[PDB]
């Protein structure tokens, strides 16, 4: 359930990161047994990226990818995947091209290896001359995506991405579609506005990112709310933890801050984050209790491995190189780190485990 404000309320008034790449299978590879080959790219900015899955020196034809989302530091992440049956002779790799790379990078597949939250992420990237900006919105409950919207897709509707949200009727999807299009119109106007506030050329591509949501404890009571904004991967304006004042990053954001303090925008957001957001999060937790209220403990086994766990939050410490937690593609997550002992903290564990 998204925010429902008028477009003029969030009216604005006035650094490249290279991707980390991981190639892996969803399950442990067995020759002759069907599996999924994954390429996980994360930590990159801007969002424009080209990813191929390779089999024996050529491109795999039917490769799908997840909806574009970003982390707390505004860097993007994507999962590219395809169904495959590995054999002894076949060799697989992932190729990634990005503005930060002087040539495409190839990473080969090594065959031999509580609290709750609702979040909404919005990304708008301008394409001068090629039309309106590319707009993608995604909604999360914990680490489970449940809705999405792509401006380039054919439906022009908010679409389900979890089984439990398909229960909702047409009135829900009509309202979500209407609201997500209003989020898109606001972001498009902001892209044109922000180019003027920074005196930038009309030919360059720029990115606007918006995030908001709410946390609740194990008692499903409100803990914290968020509402943050970024331009080209850098903090622009953010609502503080008290949800009553703004953090502006530069002089252009200070003018928006004063326009938003006078028009009382923070008060309209706090009503949503403390009320509506919490209310519908509890509705989602109830309707998807078989999915959302589960915890899968990591199957564990110098390299400490942790597989098939949910939620994604985990801690692996050696008593050193730790990879970013990665999606298996089936709702679970994976991670590993590199006299000695390995400590594993996870919500699905009674007490921290120790691997020697």
């Amino acid at each position, epitope marked *: 359930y998204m925010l429902d404000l008028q477009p003029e309320t969030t009216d604005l008034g006035c650094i490249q990161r290279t991707p980390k790449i991981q190639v892996y299978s969803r399950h442990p590879a067995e020759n002759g047994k069907s599996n999924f080959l994954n390429c996980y790219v994360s930590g990159f900015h801007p969002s424009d990226i080209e990813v191929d899955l390779l089999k024996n*020196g*050529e*491109r795999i034809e039917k490769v799908e990818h997840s909806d574009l989302s970003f982390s707390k530091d505004w860097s993007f992440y994507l999962l590219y995947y395809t169904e495959f049956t590995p054999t002894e002779k076949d060799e697989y790799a992932c190729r990634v*091209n990005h*503005v930060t790379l002087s040539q*495409p990078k*190839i990473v080969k597949w090594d065959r031999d290896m509580g609290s709750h939250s609702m979040r909404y992420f919005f990304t708008s990237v301008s394409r001068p001359g090629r039309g309106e900006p590319r707009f993608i919105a995604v909604g999360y409950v914990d680490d489970t995506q449940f809705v999405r919207f792509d401006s380039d897709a054919a439906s022009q509707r908010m679409e389900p991405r979890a089984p439990w949200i398909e229960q909702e009727g047409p009135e829900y999807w009509d309202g979500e579609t209407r609201k997500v299009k209003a989020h898109s119109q606001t972001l498009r106007v902001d892209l044109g506005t922000l180019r003027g506030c920074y005196n930038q050329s009309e030919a360059g591509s720029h990115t606007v990112q918006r995030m908001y949501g709410c946390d609740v404890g194990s008692d499903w009571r409100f803990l914290r709310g968020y509402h943050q904004y970024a331009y080209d991967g850098k903090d622009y304006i953010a609502l503080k933890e008290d949800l009553r004042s703004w953090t502006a990053a530069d002089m252009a954001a200070q003018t928006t801050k004063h326009k938003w303090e006078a028009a009382h925008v923070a008060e309209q957001l706090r009503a949503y984050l403390e009320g509506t957001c919490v209310e519908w999060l509890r509705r989602y937790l109830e309707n998807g209790k078989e999915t959302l209220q589960r915890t899968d403990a990591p199957k564990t086994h110098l390299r400490c491995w942790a597989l098939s766990f949910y939620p994604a939050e985990i801690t692996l410490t050696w008593q050193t190189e730790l990879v970013e937690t990665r999606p298996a593609g089936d709702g679970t997550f994976q991670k590993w780190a590199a006299r000695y002992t390995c400590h594993v903290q996870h919500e699905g564990l009674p007490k921290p485990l120790t691997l020697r």
Partner: nanobody, 112 residues
Framework: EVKLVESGGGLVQPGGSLRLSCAAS????????MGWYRQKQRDLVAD???????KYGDSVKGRFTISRDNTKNTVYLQMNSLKPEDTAVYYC??????????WGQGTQVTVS
């Protein structure tokens, strides 16, 4: 191990055309996909597998055509309706059947 011999670049008037060609050395068993990138980053222009499966970058779709000799490991790029924004160094590249990439030195293409 593998050497890529490029040819066919140079100067051309807007609207004109050029044919690039890239020949791979070594065994015919050592190269699968062949194609071109063009140039911070370098962008995909066109590539083709040994079986004839092609892929084109969006900015050259319709105007550029890549083809391959069945006998040798040699590919050709027919670049039609060239624009000033097509000016770049075009790098030939190839992929071994173990996903090792080989890169040529590149050929400058300039459109007046």
């Amino acid at each position: 191990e593998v050497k890529l011999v490029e040819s066919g670049g140079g100067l051309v008037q807007p609207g004109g055309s050029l044919r690039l060609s890239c020949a791979a050395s070594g065994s015919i068993f050592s190269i699968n996909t062949m194609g071109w990138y063009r140039q911070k980053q370098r962008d995909l222009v066109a590539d083709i597998s040994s079986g004839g499966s092609t892929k084109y970058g969006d900015s050259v779709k319709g105007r550029f055509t890549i083809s391959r000799d069945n006998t040798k490991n040699t590919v050709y790029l027919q670049m039609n309706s060239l624009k000033p924004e097509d000016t770049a160094v075009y790098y030939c590249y190839g992929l071994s059947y173990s996903n090792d990439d080989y890169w040529g030195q590149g050929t400058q293409v300039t459109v007046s």
